[PDB]
Amino acid sequence: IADQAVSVYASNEGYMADVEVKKIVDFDAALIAYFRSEYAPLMKQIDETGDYNKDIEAAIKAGIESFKAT
Amino acid sequence: DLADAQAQVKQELDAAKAQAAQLIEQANRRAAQLIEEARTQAAAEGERIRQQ
Amino acid sequence: DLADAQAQVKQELDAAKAQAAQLIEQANRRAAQLIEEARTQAAAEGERIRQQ
Amino acid sequence: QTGYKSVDTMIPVGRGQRELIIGDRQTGKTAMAIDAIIAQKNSGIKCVYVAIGQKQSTIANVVRKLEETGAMAY
Numbered sequence: 001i002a003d004q005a006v007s008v009y010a011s012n013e014g015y016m017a018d019v020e021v022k023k024i025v026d027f028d029a030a031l032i033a034y035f036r037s038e039y040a041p042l043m044k045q046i047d048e049t050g051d052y053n054k055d056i057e058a059a060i061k062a063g064i065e066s067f068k069a070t
Numbered sequence: 071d072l073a074d075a076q077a078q079v080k081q082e083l084d085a086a087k088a089q090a091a092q093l094i095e096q097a098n099r100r101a102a103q104l105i106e107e108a109r110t111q112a113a114a115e116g117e118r119i120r121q122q
Numbered sequence: 123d124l125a126d127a128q129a130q131v132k133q134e135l136d137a138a139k140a141q142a143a144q145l146i147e148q149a150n151r152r153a154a155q156l157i158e159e160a161r162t163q164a165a166a167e168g169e170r171i172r173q174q
Numbered sequence: 175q176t177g178y179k180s181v182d183t184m185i186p187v188g189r190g191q192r193e194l195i196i197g198d199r200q201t202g203k204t205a206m207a208i209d210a211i212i213a214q215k216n217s218g219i220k221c222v223y224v225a226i227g228q229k230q231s232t233i234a235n236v237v238r239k240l241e242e243t244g245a246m247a248y
């Protein structure tokens with residue numbers, strides 16, 4: 001669930017209207033790797049529940065900035 | 071101005087080295103984890119094949 | 123002013139090294155998956171030996 | 175869950191809903207349902223499919239894929 005969750009988050013946050021057209025999907029997959037490596041407890045927790053909390057999206061955007069840095 | 075220019079040259083050189091280090095470490099860790107997980111996956115696939 | 127430009131060129135140049143690292147990762151992943159397929163067909167041959 | 179982004183998001187499908195899939199030949203009509211089924215592996219829900227007047231080659235392809243997944247146990 002977190003996969004498409006973070007994808008749509010990035011889209012709505014305009015986090016995609018900024019990066020390369022073709023590189024979109026590459027960024028996506030590398031983002032999945034980035035997070036499920038670093039944030040594996042985070043996505044585990046969120047997908048085990050299906051509920052969202054604001055601090056969760058805070059962690060999400062933190063990961064957003066960290067991966068955009070990478 | 072010349073003294074300040076050399077100072078900022080060194081200041082940016084150090085940052086360039088640091089960022090190169092960060093990139094080279096991060097990418098290598100990601101690739102290594104990639105390889106690890108691929109090996110585990112295909113091994114498990116092999117045992118499943120033999121169960122078949 | 124000339125001194126100011128060269129620093130930017132070096133910083134721009136690091137980008138090339140970052141791109142180069144990616145080639146390493148790509149070649150290594152291709153090798154890893156080729157190895158994966160080779161041992162896949164090897165497991166296939168072992169299963170064939172089971173068939174005999 | 176359908177194991178998709180396009181599907182699961184823009185077109186929700188819940189338990190018990192009927193939803194036709196329509197398209198042309200070799201355009202990706204079954205592969206979608208197959209993925210959906212494989213998704214249900216962990217869920218443990220009841221899943222069952224019927225082949226209706228198609229080529230046995232296609233049949234055995236589907237089969238071999240399923241047992242490859244090991245899905246053909248639930």
Ligand SMILES: Nc1ncnc2c1ncn2[C@@H]1O[C@H](COP(=O)(O)OP(=O)(O)OP(=O)(O)O)[C@@H](O)[C@H]1O
Nearest residue numbers: 197198199200201202203204205206208228229232
């Ligand atoms: N996500 C995908 N990416 C690339 N190719 C895909 C994808 N999904 C399905 N396909 C391809 O679509 C091709 C055509 O679909 P498929 O042959 O599986 O059944 P179909 O669309 O229902 O057609 P038919 O009328 O023969 O039953 C398949 O060979 C499959 O590899």
Ligand SMILES: [Mg+2]
Nearest residue numbers: 200203204205
């Ligand atoms: Mg079909």
